[PDB]
């Protein structure tokens, strides 16, 4: 049995219409957001490419 | 918090200055022209200065937008390719 690293799950678990699970975004939030207005919109998440491969291993059967 | 010792060995880790967006490209609302960073309005650049000055973009899409103030403030006019 392969144990998915439960951490990354809570972190970037997803799978758009084609893998590339959309991680997440946000920076300084919930610490220092008393700075900047515009450059701070949660918008939504996004994934990567140079890094995706590493974040790939979790999931298997579609869960949530 | 003593990291004071002159030595004069100390960087800057410089960025952005570059003259990217050289000449009159095909266009696109791309940056092209930044130098000092800040920047504001610009529109279809025309390259300006004073005395000598006045570059002549001539080619862009419809709103270059870039050049702060060290290189020909604002720009744009009636120039596109055929007209504007």
């Amino acid at each position: 049995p392969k144990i998915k690293t439960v951490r990354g799950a809570a972190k970037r678990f997803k799978k758009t219409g084609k893998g590339g699970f959309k991680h997440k975004h946000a920076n300084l939030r919930h610490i220092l957001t008393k700075k900047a207005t515009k450059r701070k919109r949660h918008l939504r998440p996004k994934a990567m490419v140079s890094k995706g491969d590493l974040g790939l291993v979790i999931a298997c059967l579609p869960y949530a | 918090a003593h990291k004071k010792a002159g030595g004069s060995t100390r960087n800057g880790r410089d960025s952005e200055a570059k003259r990217l967006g050289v000449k009159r490209f095909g266009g696109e609302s791309v940056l092209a022209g930044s130098i000092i960073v800040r920047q504001r309005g610009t529109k279809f650049h025309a390259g300006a200065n004073v005395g000598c000055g006045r570059d002549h973009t001539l080619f862009a899409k419809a709103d270059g937008k870039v050049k702060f103030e060290v290189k020909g403030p604002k720009n744009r006019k009636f120039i596109s390719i055929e007209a504007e």
Binding site: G8, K11, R12, H25, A26, P45, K51, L54, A64 | -
Partner: protein, 96 residues
């Protein structure tokens, strides 16, 4: 097993909160099949072959998807315009 450079850190940055829909999964019933391997009694609960809800569940709600009926006392509690207007060649029903 010498994954020197644990994947975690440097990849492990920013981690949004989240929870879980206690809905089992609320399978949609299905690809707009209702009625026909659906026991042809059109309603829906579980003993099916071609398209099945799989039973362990709370509610359904069918999307409309593949090819529809020709007969269909559609129930399943459930909904969608995909449903009301495609399955509509027959048997409305929704109930609760």
């Amino acid at each position: 097993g010498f994954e020197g450079g644990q994947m975690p850190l440097y990849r492990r940055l920013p981690k949004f909160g989240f929870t879980s829909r206690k809905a089992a999964i609320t399978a949609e019933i299905r690809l707009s099949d209702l009625a026909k391997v659906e026991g042809g009694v059109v309603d829906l609960n579980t003993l099916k072959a071609a398209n099945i809800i799989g039973i362990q569940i709370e509610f359904a709600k069918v999307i409309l998807a593949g090819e529809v009926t020709t007969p269909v006392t559609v129930r399943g509690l459930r909904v969608t315009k995909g449903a009301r207007a495609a399955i509509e060649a027959a048997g409305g029903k929704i109930e609760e």
